[PDB]
C-alpha cells in the first residue's frame, strides 16, 4: 500500500478484479445467455454455471455439462448476457 490510496471510487477492473464479497457492493460473477442453436430450434435461456444437464426438445437432448464452475456448452453458439 502507498498508505494514502482512495477507496471511495475504484478503478473499473484494476480494483474490481478482487473477490466478489471483498468489493464495496457485492456483485455476482455470473451471467445468463440467450441461445438458439440448430439441434433445437428454440430461443432457450440458460445460466452460465449450469450445475445440471440442460435438455433439448429437438434431435439433440443435451446442451450443457456441469463442470467445476462455469459450464461447457457445445457446438451451438447462441450467446448474450444480456445486461447482467
Amino acid at each position: 500500500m502507498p498508505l494514502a490510496k482512495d477507496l471511495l471510487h475504484p478503478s473499473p477492473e484494476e480494483e474490481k478484479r478482487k473477490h466478489k464479497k471483498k468489493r464495496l457492493v457485492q456483485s455476482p460473477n455470473s451471467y445468463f445467455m440467450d441461445v438458439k442453436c440448430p439441434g433445437c430450434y428454440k430461443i432457450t435461456t440458460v445460466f452460465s454455471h449450469a450445475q445440471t444437464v440442460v435438455l433439448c426438445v429437438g434431435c439433440s437432448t443435451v446442451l450443457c455439462q456441469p463442470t467445476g464452475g462455469k459450464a461447457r456448452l457445445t457446438e451451438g453458439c447462441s450467446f448474450r448476457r444480456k445486461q447482467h
Partner: protein
C-alpha cells in the same frame, strides 16, 4: 462471532491513524457507531464521513486527521450516577482540561460534559481524547 461490533471498529481507526492514513473502511455499520462518530466529529477529531449502503448492513468510510491520538472502548457497559463520574474520568483521561468520555442516557448519546447539565446518568460506552 463478532460479539461487540463497536469494540472491533475503533481499533481499526486507531491502528490506521498511527501508520499515517486518511481513509479507512469499517464494517459492519451499526447505528451505534454513527452517533458515536457524530459527537466525535463536532469537537473536531475527524472529518466528514460517507456511509455506503448495502442491504447486508452497510459499510462506512471516514476521513480523518492526526488530531486523534486514540479512541478506546470500555466493555462491559457499567452504570454511572453522577458521583461515580469523577472516579471514572480521572482514570480514563490524560487531563481534566480535555478528553471526552462518551455515554448513552435516556436523553440520547452524548459526551459526559453535556450529561452533567441535564442531570442524566446512564451507561458508558467508550472514550477518546
Amino acid at each position: 462471532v463478532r460479539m461487540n461490533v463497536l469494540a472491533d471498529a475503533l481499533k481499526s481507526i486507531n491502528n490506521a491513524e498511527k501508520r499515517g492514513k486518511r481513509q479507512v473502511l469499517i464494517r459492519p455499520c451499526s447505528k451505534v457507531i454513527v452517533r458515536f462518530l457524530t459527537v466525535m466529529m463536532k469537537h473536531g477529531y475527524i472529518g466528514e464521513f460517507e456511509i455506503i449502503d448495502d442491504h447486508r448492513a452497510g459499510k462506512i468510510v471516514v476521513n480523518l486527521t492526526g488530531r486523534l491520538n486514540k479512541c478506546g472502548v470500555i466493555s462491559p457497559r457499567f452504570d454511572v450516577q453522577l458521583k461515580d463520574l469523577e472516579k471514572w474520568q480521572n482514570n480514563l483521561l490524560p487531563s481534566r482540561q480535555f478528553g471526552f468520555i462518551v455515554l448513552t442516557t435516556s436523553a440520547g448519546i452524548m459526551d459526559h460534559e453535556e450529561a452533567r447539565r441535564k442531570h442524566t446518568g446512564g451507561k458508558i460506552l467508550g472514550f477518546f481524547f
